[PDB]
Amino acid sequence: VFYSYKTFFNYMNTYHPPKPSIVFSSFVTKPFEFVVFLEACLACYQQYEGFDEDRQVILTTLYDLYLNLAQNDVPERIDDWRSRATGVLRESNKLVYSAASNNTSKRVDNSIMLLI
Amino acid sequence: LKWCVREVPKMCNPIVYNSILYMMITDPRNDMILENDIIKFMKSNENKYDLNFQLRLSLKFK
């Protein structure tokens, strides 16, 4: 039972992919397993500029999962996960302040992040 | 908020709709009339709310 995507990636080691949220509903139960997959997808989409607005959706989903996480998880790892979401909050700056230069792009307001 | 949304639907943003949906689904109490009103509001103003976020909120709130 991996608690991080890095450990699973280490153990394990064409065309435009569809929206990662298309099959997100299939992981309603057991979010711990889907957390690693979401983290890996976000890391993969981080490079090559992430097309457009895909990184914002990935970050919003990760932040929502992290907020849901550690709510009633193991007390020993509660502090760590809550710390990890802080990095996402830092990424929120990269998703708000550094989201785009605003020269031509309309960007994406993180209002859902504020509500969460 | 509802009066502003109804009067100025042309001048609005999806953030307002999401906030209204969250406020309606907060549900400090439980009532069938409130559920019917929420369903009617969603049907009238569909295609403007985050499906995944709304589904997650509904599942969490039971």
Swiss-Prot record, chain A:
Highest taxon listed in the record's lineage: Eukaryota
Protein localization: Vacuole membrane
Signal peptide: none
Subunit field text: Component of the homotypic vacuole fusion and vacuole protein sorting (HOPS) complex, which is composed of a core of the 4 class C Vps proteins PEP5/VPS11, PEP3/VPS18, VPS16, VPS33 associated to VAM6/VPS39 and VPS41/VAM2. HOPS associates with phosphoinositides and the PX domain of VAM7. Component of the class C core vacuole/endosome tethering (CORVET) complex, which is composed of a core of the 4 class C Vps proteins PEP5/VPS11, PEP3/VPS18, VPS16, VPS33 associated to VPS3/PEP6 and VPS8. Interacts with PEP3, PEP7 and VAM7.
Protein family according to the UniProt entry: Belongs to the VPS11 family.
Function description: Required for vacuolar biogenesis and for trafficking of hydrolase precursors to the vacuole. Mediates transport at the vacuolar membrane where it may be responsible for tethering transport vesicles on the target membranes. It is required for gluconeogenic growth of yeast. Acts as a component of the HOPS complex that acts during the docking stage of vacuole fusion. HOPS is an effector for the vacuolar Rab GTPase YPT7 and is required for vacuolar SNARE complex assembly. It remains bound to SNARE complexes after vacuole fusion.
Extra information: Present with 1200 molecules/cell in log phase SD medium.
Protein name: E3 ubiquitin-protein ligase PEP5
Organism for this UniProt entry: Saccharomyces cerevisiae (strain ATCC 204508 / S288c)
Gene (name only): PEP5
Covered residues, full protein: 619 to 755 of 1029
Swiss-Prot record, chain B:
Cell compartments where the protein resides: Vacuole membrane
Source organism, top-level taxon: Eukaryota
Disulphide connectivity of cysteines: none
Role of this protein: Required for vacuolar biogenesis and for trafficking of hydrolase precursors to the vacuole. Mediates transport at the vacuolar membrane where it may be responsible for tethering transport vesicles on the target membranes. Acts as a component of the HOPS complex that acts during the docking stage of vacuole fusion. HOPS is an effector for the vacuolar Rab GTPase YPT7 and is required for vacuolar SNARE complex assembly. It remains bound to SNARE complexes after vacuole fusion.
Sequence similarity: Belongs to the VPS18 family.
More info: Present with 2020 molecules/cell in log phase SD medium.
The protein's assembly and partners: Component of the HOPS complex which is composed of PEP5, VPS16, PEP3, VPS33, VPS39 and VPS41. HOPS associates with phosphoinositides and the PX domain of VAM7. Interacts with PEP5, PEP7 and VAM7.
Protein name: Vacuolar membrane protein PEP3
The organism of origin for this protein: Saccharomyces cerevisiae (strain ATCC 204508 / S288c) (Baker's yeast)
Classification lineage: Eukaryota, Fungi, Dikarya, Ascomycota, Saccharomycotina
